[PDB]
Design a protein around this ligand. Structure first.
Ligand SMILES: CCCCCCCCCCC(=O)OC[C@H](COP(=O)(O)OC[C@H](O)COP(=O)(O)OC[C@@H](COC(=O)CC)OC(=O)CCC)OC(=O)CCCCCCCC
Ligand SMILES: CCCCCCCCCCCCCCCC(=O)OC[C@H](COP(=O)([O-])OCC[N+](C)(C)C)OC(=O)CCCCCCCCCCCCCCC
Ligand SMILES: CCCCCCCCCCCCCCCCCC(=O)OC[C@H](COP(=O)(O)OCCN)OC(=O)CCCCCCCCCCCCC
Ligand code: HEC
Ligand code: HEC
Ligand code: HEC
Ligand SMILES: COc1c(O)c(C)c(C/C=C(\C)CC/C=C(\C)CC/C=C(\C)CC/C=C(\C)CC/C=C(/C)CCC=C(C)C)c(O)c1OC
Ligand SMILES: CCCCCCCCCCCCCCC(=O)OCCCOP(=O)(O)OC[C@@H](O)COP(=O)(O)OCCCOC(C)=O
Ligand SMILES: CCCCCCCCCCCCCCC(=O)O[C@H](COC(=O)CCCCCCCCCCCC)COP(=O)(O)O
Ligand SMILES: CCCCCCCCCCCCCCCCCC(=O)O[C@H](COC(=O)CCCCCC)COP(=O)(O)OCCN
Ligand SMILES: CCCCCCCCCCCCCC(=O)O[C@H](COC(=O)CCCCCCCCCCC)COP(=O)(O)O
Lengths: 42, 54, 75, 385, 248, 93
């Protein structure tokens, strides 16, 4: 098996990448954690 | 989601959004939780007793 | 003429058959101790038989019964 | 190079919490160290902000604690965080030392790390005892009395040592004042020992739950174990918030809200919950001097541990009998705590003696014999002749 | 020990302030203060409860002021150094009936009545213990128990022999709101009042506990998401190995 | 600064493991990766596997010591009762 044949990631990849959707969802969740951390630190 | 990155692109407006969100969240969460904690204990607080005493 | 709630519940749960058998054991113990305390030499023995444990069984049954109902029947 | 690498101060922050090469297979049991650091910061900050309102006279100690819990704004938060966080500090430290015994982190080349850990453990027991005596309740006064009379057991010298500790003739005003000064002092020694602990760790890196090297697949500290420790930090704060706000006085003993009375002895004198195995070890020996020696030997027998583990593989992960006898040991330690919480009654004396013997037999007989048998069993299982 | 020295186990009464959301019953605290003042306060100090803590909790402002002005405290002395008294104010503490310990032991057959500021937090069982202590006196002790003279029996006290008298009888006080004041009613009221006296922070403690548990549970779930997010490059990582050419 | 002794962990570049060759890695960005796709079916079946392989080493010592504690506590509350007071007399002396 060559080193150019990438193994199977297809069970764990997104069916649609859409690089603003995924980054917006991730930054929304990180921002929610930062929101509640700011409230708790206050 | 959508194409709006005026909230997530720049870290200044992102951390300003997080601070404004927490500034609203403190007030809203405190008022809501005080209203629920007094609604769950209707009749036991001193407000109800002072309103009961003529 | 509103009597106390707790003795009402205590008499009501002394009147059940477990309460009747348990006060039967307790009154039997009390009669044992009452006939113990007339023979001479009772002032000078090694120990004394008492009904602390039968009274503990009776009192534990009664308040295990009457604990969840009492504050319902109170203001 | 980068500024986090070229600066003198940020190079330590880099090489400890940013670019530290961690083994990429470590589970959540390698998180109790960060959790103990957070809980130590909690203890120190609440200790300062609560010791701004504390007067350490013997006639004014208990009244000042109640002044904190009543008159100081949010003072109940401070005291309840402080006492229940000391309980969680010992619980996370017990879990951390159990992680040390299980995965074989005591073995070479990490003997210095294990010895500095045992020194931190002794200093933390000392800090908790001094701070519990600073409350000056009923249990505080009588526990201080019993522990210092245990120090009076020392032959030919001990009575003068105890009159030196007390600063008088019984547990009085100089005793409580010097316990407050020492109790303010010893956590900074604990912080210095923690920094020495991190140095002795950093010269070889963490272990891994397999017991093989981790030099092949290292991942950095930053974002990976930062957010994994953030997960357990939020879980720890959640459980601490439960036991502070909803049920604060569960872990404590209710006799500690009686003021300190030297005339009335309690019906059952018991330390706070985590010193009970050591109190059971000491109470199981029918002698005062041998009792004190056995109580300190029950911690020094952790120092004699890397020299008795004769297993050639690191850690109890892939070994059957060592894992079984490890959980025998853990539930024996819990049984020591529960024996110590009881009275000096039949059959708790005999069970305390058997439980102390199984403690010392695990540290001195069971580990080398089971490790030797497991080595020979691994050999003859796969070698044919 | 036997069960006699340990004392009988007080059962689980369903108080109106158990549970992680229920607060105190402040009308019950008001009636508990009335039963305190008319029964207990002949023989129990309450040394750690100031008058100002009752304002807005169980009584109004003028009620606490006109209850505190019935008592006399030590004023600063006059211009000739003579000691003088003054009526009470809001900043003083609730005074005990006894000037010192020896007067207490003289007036109560040697036994010292303990200060009740923390008595529901300094006994195992707590509220249930105090209620079962008050409503637990038998009409006569069980057969075979020789009480020392001057002492009384109830099984909930550790040892059986207590030096208290049965001091809750039917309708010895009158309530302001017209509640039927039986023994169990008064005992429930004073046990709620002593729970207030030991734990005046109880209401605010439970609501700040609600806020803190909600915020930390949300933070814990958000942090689980971010840990599963930033480790996704490492959980799904794969390794294949074709063994190299052995000539080198 | 002075040199130090031989450690068993170097740094990024000279870590000190064995030389490795022909072993290739493959990883995908987490922005194009869906997190927590493996919580359902995972927290059931993998958690049951992790419990089945690993529970009995915890359950047998807990069973032994809990049975021994329960037998001891039952014998305590026996011999400090009225029934076993003569046995308390003969084993306490
Ligand atoms: C008592 C007061 C202490 C206060 C300290 C607060 C912190 C408590 C720490 C407890 C602990 O560290 O145990 C870790 C133990 C081993 O972990 P592992 O790496 O082998 O499992 C990998 C996981 O599937 C990865 O899954 P993942 O990493 O994606 O998420 C892990 C989990 C976080 O939970 C925890 O950290 C422990 C509760 O996220 C969840 O999905 C939670 C769902 C509600 O976790 C377990 O999996 C449980 C195994 C039995 C342990 C019982 C403990 C009894 C003492
Ligand atoms: C001690 C506890 C104190 C807690 C206070 C929390 C204050 C807010 C923290 C959350 C926050 O606003 O973080 C935002 C930044 C960036 O966080 P990020 O999303 O990982 O960075 C990406 C930046 N983009 C590409 C989105 C523009 O993150 C930062 O600037 C890092 C701040 C970390 C503070 C610790
Ligand atoms: C003086 C010296 C101090 C001594 C301290 C004494 C012990 C203090 C008690 C603290 C509790 C800590 C428990 C032990 C912590 C280590 C356990 C552990 O490492 O978990 C992993 C273990 C096996 O997992 P593996 O790593 O082998 O998996 C590899 C996959 N092939 O997984 C397991 O086997 C299950 C782990 C379940 C933990 C059970 C904890 C029981 C806690 C006591 C309960 C008390 C109430 C009865
Ligand atoms: C001033 C700094 C200070 C530090 C640092 C500190 N404490 Fe304390 N601690 C106190 C004070 C003051 C008290 C007594 C007041 C109280 O108990 O609320 C106390 C009390 C205690 C108590 C008894 C709590 C109670 O009410 O029963 C324990 C247990 C304790 N400390 C443990 C620790 C541990 C463990 C550490 C750190 C490793 C620590 N303390 C660090 C100030 C401190
Ligand atoms: C008696 C044992 C012991 C005690 C007590 C102890 N440590 Fe450790 N600590 C260790 C060992 C062993 C390791 C490394 C184990 C391994 O990596 O396999 C360690 C590792 C650590 C780590 C690295 C992360 C980790 O989990 O390995 C930190 C951080 C740490 N300790 C901090 C502390 C702090 C803070 C305290 C309390 C003040 C403390 N330790 C008490 C033995 C101990
Ligand atoms: C006759 C005087 C007297 C009155 C009136 C009185 N007490 Fe007592 N009480 C005592 C004495 C004396 C003790 C001490 C008992 C002992 O030390 O054995 C005591 C002890 C107590 C105790 C602690 C018992 C223990 O074992 O710890 C409580 C609780 C208590 N009283 C509640 C009350 C309450 C509530 C009232 C008001 C209803 C009250 N008492 C009124 C004399 C009194
Ligand atoms: C192995 O990899 C590591 C690792 O290398 C490290 C370092 C850590 C982190 C561990 C720690 C940070 C633990 C070390 C703890 C300390 C050094 C304790 C330090 C705390 C103090 C010195 C006390 C704090 C003191 C203050 C904050 C002073 C300010 C306080 C007050 C009260 C001033 C207020 C007064 C006024 C007037 C406002 C890890 O968790 C870790 O695993 C990921
Ligand atoms: C996960 C938690 C996140 C929360 C964020 C807060 C965490 C903060 C943790 C900061 C940790 C810093 C403390 C570590 C420390 O003090 O160790 C210094 C030891 C340096 O010696 P070395 O490791 O051999 O380094 C290599 C040195 O030999 C280089 O020689 P030289 O340049 O002289 O350096 C010696 C420093 C002397 O200072 C000390 C204290 O030792
Ligand atoms: C000295 C005390 C030791 C306590 C041990 C605490 C161990 C965990 C510390 C967590 C620090 C998180 C910083 C991560 C970071 O900056 O990443 C930064 C940005 O990440 C974030 O913004 C995280 C969101 C905000 C989280 C705030 C958490 C505050 C609550 C802390 C509670 C404990 C004090 C870099 O992230 P990136 O490299 O992936 O881009
Ligand atoms: C509890 C700590 C025990 C001892 C362990 C030591 C570890 C300390 C960790 C401190 C981490 C945070 C320090 C950040 C400071 C970095 C700023 C800096 O280095 O800039 C420095 C200047 O620093 C200062 O002036 C003030 C430093 C005061 C720090 C007091 C906290 C820039 O200097 P530079 O490295 O570029 O050298 C060029 C020479 N002209
Ligand atoms: C300095 C170390 C202190 C760490 C405390 C952790 C223990 C958890 C219990 C905290 C309860 C005390 C706070 C409180 O009562 O707030 C209560 C609200 O609960 C919280 O938000 C606590 C969330 C904790 C988040 C931790 C963030 C990390 C901050 C690091 C320091 C900058 C009261 O809120 P309020 O006074 O009404 O604004």
């Amino acid at each position: 098996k060559s080193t150019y044949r990438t193994p199977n990631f297809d069970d764990v990849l997104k069916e649609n990448n859409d690089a603003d959707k995924g980054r917006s969802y991730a930054y929304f969740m990180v921002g929610a954690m930062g929101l509640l951390s700011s409230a708790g630190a206050k | 989601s959508s194409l709006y990155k005026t909230f997530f692109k720049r870290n200044a407006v992102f951390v300003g959004t997080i601070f404004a969100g927490a500034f609203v969240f403190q007030t809203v969460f405190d008022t809501a939780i005080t209203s629920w904690y007094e609604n769950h204990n209707k009749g036991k607080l001193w407000k109800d007793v002072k309103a009961r005493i003529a | 003429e509103v009597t106390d709630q707790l003795e009402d519940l205590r008499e009501h749960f002394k009147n059940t058959e477990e309460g009747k058998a348990l006060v039967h054991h307790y009154e039997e113990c009390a009669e044992r101790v009452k006939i113990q305390q007339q023979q001479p030499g009772y002032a000078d023995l090694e120990h004394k038989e008492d009904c602390v444990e039968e009274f503990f069984h009776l009192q534990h049954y009664l308040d295990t019964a009457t604990a969840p109902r009492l504050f319902d029947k109170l203001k | 190079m980068a500024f986090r690498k070229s600066n003198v101060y940020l190079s330590l922050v880099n090489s400890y919490i940013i670019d530290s090469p961690q083994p990429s297979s470590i589970n959540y049991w390698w998180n109790m160290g960060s959790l103990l650091g957070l809980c130590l910061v909690i203890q120190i900050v609440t200790g300062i902000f609560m010791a701004m309102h504390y007067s350490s006279n013997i006639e004014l100690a208990f009244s000042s604690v109640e002044h904190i819990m009543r008159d100081v704004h949010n003072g109940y938060i401070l005291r309840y965080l402080h006492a229940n966080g000391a309980s969680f500090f010992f619980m996370v430290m017990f879990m951390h030392m159990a992680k040390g015994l299980y995965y074989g982190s005591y073995r070479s080349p990490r003997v210095t790390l294990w010895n500095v850990g045992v020194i931190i453990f002794i200093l933390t027991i000392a800090t908790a005892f001094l701070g519990y005596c600073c409350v000056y309740g009923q249990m505080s006064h009588w526990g201080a009395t019993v522990i210092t009379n245990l120090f009076s057991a020392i032959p030919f010298v001990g009575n003068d040592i105890v009159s030196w500790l007390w600063g008088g003739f019984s547990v009085s005003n100089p005793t409580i004042q010097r316990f407050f000064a020492l109790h303010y002092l010893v956590p900074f020694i604990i912080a210095a020992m923690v920094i020495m602990h991190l140095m002795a760790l950093h010269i070889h890196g963490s272990s891994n739950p397999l017991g093989i090297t981790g030099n092949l697949d290292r991942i950095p500290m930053h974002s990976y174990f930062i957010f994994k420790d953030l997960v357990t930090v939020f879980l720890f704060m959640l459980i601490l918030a439960l036991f502070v706000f909803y049920s604060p006085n569960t872990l404590g003993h209710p006799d500690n809200y009686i003021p300190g009375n030297p005339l009335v002895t309690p019906a059952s004198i018991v330390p706070e919950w985590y010193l009970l195995p050591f109190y059971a070890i000491l109470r199981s020996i029918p002698d005062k001097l041998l009792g004190v020696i056995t109580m300190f030997a029950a911690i020094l027998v952790l120092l004699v541990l890397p020299f008795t583990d004769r297993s050639v593989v690191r850690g109890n992960t892939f070994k059957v009998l060592s894992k079984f006898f490890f959980f025998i040991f853990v539930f024996n330690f819990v049984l020591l705590g529960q024996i110590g919480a009881c009275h000096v009654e039949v059959p708790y004396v005999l069970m305390g003696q058997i439980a102390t013997f199984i403690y010392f037999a695990y540290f001195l007989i069971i580990v080398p014999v089971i490790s030797t048998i497991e080595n020979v069993l691994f050999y003859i299982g796969r070698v044919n002749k | 020990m036997t069960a006699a020295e340990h004392g009988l186990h007080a059962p689980a009464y369903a108080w109106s302030h158990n549970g992680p959301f229920e607060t105190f019953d402040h009308a019950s605290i008001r009636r508990g203060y009335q039963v305190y003042r008319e029964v207990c306060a002949a023989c129990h100090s309450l040394d750690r409860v100031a008058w100002r803590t009752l304002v807005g909790v169980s009584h109004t402002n003028e009620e606490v002021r006109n209850m505190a002005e019935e008592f006399e405290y030590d004023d600063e002395p006059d211009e000739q150094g003579n000691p003088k008294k003054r009526p009470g104010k809001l900043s003083d503490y609730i005074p005990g009936p006894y000037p010192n310990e020896q007067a207490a032991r003289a007036a109560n057959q040697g036994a010292l009545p303990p200060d009740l500021s923390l008595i529901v937090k300094a006994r195992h069982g707590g509220c249930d213990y105090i209620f079962s202590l008050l409503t637990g006196y038998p009409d006569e002790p069980p057969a075979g128990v020789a009480l020392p003279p001057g002492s009384n029996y109830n099984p909930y006290f550790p040892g059986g022999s207590i030096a208290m008298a049965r001091v809750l009888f039917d309708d010895m006080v009158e309530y302001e709101d017209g509640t039927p004041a039986t023994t169990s009613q008064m005992a429930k009221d004073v046990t709620t009042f002593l729970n207030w006296c030991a734990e005046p922070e109880h209401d605010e403690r439970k609501r700040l506990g609600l806020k803190t548990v909600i915020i930390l549970s949300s933070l814990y779930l958000l942090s689980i998401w971010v840990k599963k997010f930033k480790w996704a490059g490492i959980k799904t990582r794969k390794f294949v190995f074709n063994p190299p050419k052995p000539r080198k | 600064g002075p040199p130090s002794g031989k450690t068993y962990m170097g740094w990024w570049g000279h870590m000190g493991g064995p030389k490795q060759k022909g072993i290739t890695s493959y990883a995908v960005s987490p922005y194009a990766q869906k997190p927590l796709q493996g919580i359902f079916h995972n927290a059931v079946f993998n958690s049951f596997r992790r419990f089945k392989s690993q529970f009995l080493y915890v359950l047998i010592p807990a069973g032994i010591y809990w049975y021994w504690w329960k037998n001891g506590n039952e014998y305590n509350e026996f011999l400090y009762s009225k029934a076993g007071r003569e046995e308390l007399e003969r084993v306490n002396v």
